[PDB]
Amino acid sequence: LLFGYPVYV
Amino acid sequence: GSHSMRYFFTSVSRPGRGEPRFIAVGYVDDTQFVRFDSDAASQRMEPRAPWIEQEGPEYWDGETRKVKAHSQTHRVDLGTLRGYYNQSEAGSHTVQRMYGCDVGSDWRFLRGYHQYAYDGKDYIALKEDLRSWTAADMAAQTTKHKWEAAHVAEQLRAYLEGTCVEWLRRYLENGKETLQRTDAPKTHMTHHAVSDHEATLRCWALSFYPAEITLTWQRDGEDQTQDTELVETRPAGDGTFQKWAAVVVPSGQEQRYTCHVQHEGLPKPLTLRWE
């Protein structure tokens, strides 16, 4: 199952 | 033995030729089980292993939504990175991301990962303590500061130690017939005369699973590295793997050499000798 929160460099 | 789940994301910018190409794949050990291709027609996370197809519609709608969201954050990342590295708006660049977890034979969390690369080299990675970041260079420090302010480590840690390992266990159980069973390597040795003075002995391991394997040559019972060649383990295309190891020997001395094969699918290591 994928991680559910947005992450931006 | 021990197991792992990993997601691999690759996003490639195509300046002036549309949206970046985004490809995502998910693996449990050496078996791919899902994928998403921004260029394919389905526009959905798709199954690539039989055991994941027993997951219901909410699973697929959720993974599809989340993977599209990963797609969009990477689209933004390419722009952000082009900026951090003061690069032209015209070149094609590649951002990669990988995250996932490992469990030991006891199925307990063993280790977690969450890291990015830009244009073929490390950019930033979560350390094994699942608490701090390792910025590969100066530019990455900006991201590091940004992630610390946004508490990205805390969110990732909760997922890696909880959700990740929980679903990995679920996958291991639903797919036990193919993820937890082994396929022993079928082995044999070939002989090829190189000249009148030398001959090549090649030790073969075919149709095995998992991919992990050790092929070693010994001469009179002692490990031999010199004059040997070991190719990269490779996919047979049906879910199993292949590998071979070769050693160049003096003509007439073939009998001194033995190939040793170690693999989880064997009650005990195998030893092969020419003839």
């Binding site: - | 006891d106 082994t182 989880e264």
Partner: protein, 95 residues
């Protein structure tokens, strides 16, 4: 994590394998991985779920019935992983 092998026998009757065994222990999960051994090389065997009975925390028993095995069949190589611990059993067909 403990377990002990109670039984493990097998026999072939007209191209079919029959194998029964039992293991008691406190395993919470298991993997039943039977292999046919043709003397050196083999292949995985597939058994119907009805021929395997697992009682979490208590036991793992098998009662493989009418499994077609090739004539080349020699011995049953049984790989089992109980609570993560791997053990191999070997069964020689009888009478």
């Amino acid at each position: 994590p403990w377990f002990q092998i109670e039984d493990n026998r097998c026999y072939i009757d007209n191209g079919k394998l029959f194998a029964r065994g039992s293991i008691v222990g406190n395993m919470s999960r298991f993997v039943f991985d039977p292999k046919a051994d043709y003397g050196g090389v083999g292949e995985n065997l597939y058994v119907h779920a009805d021929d395997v009975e697992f009682v979490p925390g208590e036991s793992l028993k098998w009662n493989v019935r009418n499994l077609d095995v090739m004539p080349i069949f020699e011995t049953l190589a049984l790989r089992l992983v109980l609570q993560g611990d791997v053990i191999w059993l070997r069964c020689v067909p009888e009478l």
